[PDB]
Amino acid sequence: STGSATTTPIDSLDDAYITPVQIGTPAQTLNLDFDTGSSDLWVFSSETTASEVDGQTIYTPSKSTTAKLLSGATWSISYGDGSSSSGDVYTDTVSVGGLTVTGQAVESAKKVSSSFTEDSTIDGLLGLAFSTLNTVSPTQQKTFFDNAKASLDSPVFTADLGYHAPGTYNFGFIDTTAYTGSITYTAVSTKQGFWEWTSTGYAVGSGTFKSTSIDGIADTGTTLLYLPATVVSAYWAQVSGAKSSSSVGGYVFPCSATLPSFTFGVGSARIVIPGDYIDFGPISTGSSSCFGGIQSSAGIGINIFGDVALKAAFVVFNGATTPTLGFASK
Ligand SMILES: NCc1ccc(C(F)(F)F)cc1
Numbered sequence: 001s002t003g004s005a006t007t008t009p010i011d012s013l014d015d016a017y018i019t020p021v022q023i024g025t026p027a028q029t030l031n032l033d034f035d036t037g038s039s040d041l042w043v044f045s046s047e048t049t050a051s052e053v054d055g056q057t058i059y060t061p062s063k064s065t066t067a068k069l070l071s072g073a074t075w076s077i078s079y080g081d082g083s084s085s086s087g088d089v090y091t092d093t094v095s096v097g098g099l100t101v102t103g104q105a106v107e108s109a110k111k112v113s114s115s116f117t118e119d120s121t122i123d124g125l126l127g128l129a130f131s132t133l134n135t136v137s138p139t140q141q142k143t144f145f146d147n148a149k150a151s152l153d154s155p156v157f158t159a160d161l162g163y164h165a166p167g168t169y170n171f172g173f174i175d176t177t178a179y180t181g182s183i184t185y186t187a188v189s190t191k192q193g194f195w196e197w198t199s200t201g202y203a204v205g206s207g208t209f210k211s212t213s214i215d216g217i218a219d220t221g222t223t224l225l226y227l228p229a230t231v232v233s234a235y236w237a238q239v240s241g242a243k244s245s246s247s248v249g250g251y252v253f254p255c256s257a258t259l260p261s262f263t264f265g266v267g268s269a270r271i272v273i274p275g276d277y278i279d280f281g282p283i284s285t286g287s288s289s290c291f292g293g294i295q296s297s298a299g300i301g302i303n304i305f306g307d308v309a310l311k312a313a314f315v316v317f318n319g320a321t322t323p324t325l326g327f328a329s330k
Pocket residue numbers: 035036037038079080081219220221222300302304
């Protein structure tokens with residue numbers, strides 16, 4: 001079997017993408033952020049502290065005839081940005097674009113950090129990293145992808161994110177009409193629980209390609225591209241007036257500049273990120289300083305190929321017994 005769902009940017013900057021997901025019987029539809037950097041399916045719910053909910057659709061297990069409390073199970077998560085949430089655990093039926101999993105662990109948020117409360121468009125997260133990162137205690141739970149794997153025609157899902165436009169998450173098949181050329185596959189390390197791979201180098205604008213190994217993770221749940229200080233400095237050196245700002249916490253650039261593209265290597269292939277994708281607009285309403293979509297990973301400890309990079313490609317997450325990542329131009 002297969003599944004297919006449209007994902008939509010939450011705002012005009014593509015800060016995140018939401019995808020409708022059906023939970024419970026009868027269906028309760030929540031718009032979740034699909035996150036290949038985490039492994040917990042957690043949702044706003046009728047158990048979430050009332051003051052911490054501001055416009056989200058909530059999951060109500062008491063109205064679902066298939067929901068079962070997972071006795072004694074708890075969860076607690078902390079994301080690399082400082083976000084966090086925690087609560088208890090139900091099992092229920094969960095469907096994404098026609099693909100149904102029974103007995104999926106649904107983590108009901110009792111507490112959420114402020115950054116979730118202020119994002120009224122996001123009802124929760126659907127984690128798609130490897131199940132070794134799931135935070136359910138004392139019994140670790142499987143992700144939606146791991147639970148569906150056996151029933152999928154092919155143990156893959158693909159991410160086709162749009163630039164200021166809707167996109168598609170497909171489960172169980174590769175849409176050969178959705179990309180140009182060939183898909184280039186590259187090896188993945190699962191040792192940290194991420195879709196971790198090694199890029200073969202980079203280029204700035206029309207410059208020479210620099211062959212160098214950049215280890216990083218493919219993360220649909222991170223907005224920007226976080227790369228080593230040396231690479232990021234070489235990119236912003238090509239933008240007149242660009243500078244790293246401590247008060248802003250990143251590279252900013254004059255909103256009147258035009259940005260060069262950024263190329264990253266996948267084996268012998270090249271994925272080109274158009275310069276417009278790197279513009280994240282004014283740092284404050286009315287400002288003439290604009291925020292850059294390529295930032296240093298020095299403070300983070302790992303390089304992150306976030307939406308900025310991934311939306312420039314058709315991306316295959318191949319969850320075969322030896323996992324691989326595929327990239328194609330589109
Ligand atoms: N999108 C989930 C996520 C967020 C942060 C990180 C970090 F910071 F640990 F790399 C990994 C995964």
